[PDB]
Amino acid sequence: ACPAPPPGQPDIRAIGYYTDKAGSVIDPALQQQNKDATAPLDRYAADVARMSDDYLRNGDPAAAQCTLSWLGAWADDGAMLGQMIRVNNDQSFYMRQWMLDAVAMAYLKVHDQANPQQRARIDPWLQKLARANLAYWDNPKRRRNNAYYWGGLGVLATGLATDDDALWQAGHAAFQKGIDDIQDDGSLPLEMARGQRALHYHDYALAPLVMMAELARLRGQDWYASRNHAIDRLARRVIEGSRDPAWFNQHTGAAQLPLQASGWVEFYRLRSPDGGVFDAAHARGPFHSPRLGGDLTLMATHGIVRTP
């Protein structure tokens, strides 16, 4: 059944790979360096997403218990509670938010199988990771773009899974900053500044906002309603952009790398079907994203959590 977890390194040394002020032009050499430096961390997230996927699929306690064993090792190791090393930007910080997103969701998914010793071992670790990612945004010179929405998702999943009301509320605030920034356009000013990756970054911003709204929904809260379903304008801007990038081309003045919408469609489809405009993207599934919690198709259809 359960293979030996990989080691849990305390430091992250990730590398930024955009050459230009707009962060739209990839230096292939730096991109390869960042891929190689983050491979073990990505493998851990992919694995913990998948083993928690398996437990959601057929309620097999072996799947959950292996997930819990893997999380408990990195908890015991104090994985990613060391130094976030800056090479040429904050890539190490972003990577810890994506990692917390992956590990916190996996934990939530298998939480109902967690015994008191497992809870007691994992919760403190997730709470420390969440509090450290929050420390990163106590600085007002750090512009709250999609990175803050990715930060929020892990903080929030942590708040829900470990029942910490303060982290839950900090998560909500991150969500609320995103919804507040949505123009009547459906655009996000800080994402419109990312040249040929504006459409990519509208998709990439919307995705953690949708997953955060799905976590609120597990507590019977409707955050999608906020500012008259402002999120719907962004959902509709992105999916239009995937069939035809004229609007973003005109409004960024920059030819848009084509986009296929990511697995936020699988949830949002069910909440606001908006004439079926999300079904073409739905057809291309299933959608796997460890940093969104894993198999989004599976979670939207049967639930993020097996028992409320």
Residue numbers in the entry: 22 to 329
Paper text:
Unlike other PLs, Smlt1473 present in the clinically relevant Stenotrophomonas maltophilia strain K279a demonstrates a wide range of pH-dependent substrate specificities toward multiple, diverse polysaccharides: hyaluronic acid (pH 5.0), poly-β-D-glucuronic (celluronic) acid (pH 7.0), poly-β-D-mannuronic acid, and poly-α-L-guluronate (pH 9.0). To decode the pH-driven multiple substrate specificities and selectivity in this single enzyme, we present the X-ray structures of Smlt1473 determined at multiple pH values in apo and mannuronate-bound states as well as the tetra-hyaluronate-docked structure. We have built and refined the structures from residues A22-L330; electron density for other residues outside this range was either weak or absent. The structure is composed of 13 α-helical segments (α-1 to α-13) connected by 14 loops (L-1 to L-14) and two β-strands (β-1 and β-2) (Fig. 2, B and C (i and ii)).
We used the tetra unit of HA [NAG (+2) (3←1) BDP (+1) (4←1) NAG (−1) (3←1) BDP (−2)] for cocrystallization with inactive mutant H168A at pH 5.0. After solving the structure, we found a significant region of diffuse electron density within the active site, but we did not observe any specific, resolvable interactions with water or other solutes. Furthermore, we were unable to model an individual sugar unit within the region of diffuse electron density, as it was not large enough to accommodate a pyranose ring including its substituents. Since we know the specific region within the tunnel that corresponds to polysaccharide binding from our high-resolution ManA-complexed enzyme structures, we performed docking studies for tetra unit of HA by taking the protein coordinates of wild-type Smlt1473 bound to tetra-ManA at pH 5. Specifically, we used the Rosetta flexible ligand protocol to generate a large number of possible models, and by utilizing scoring parameters we were able to find the most plausible tetra-HA-docked structure.
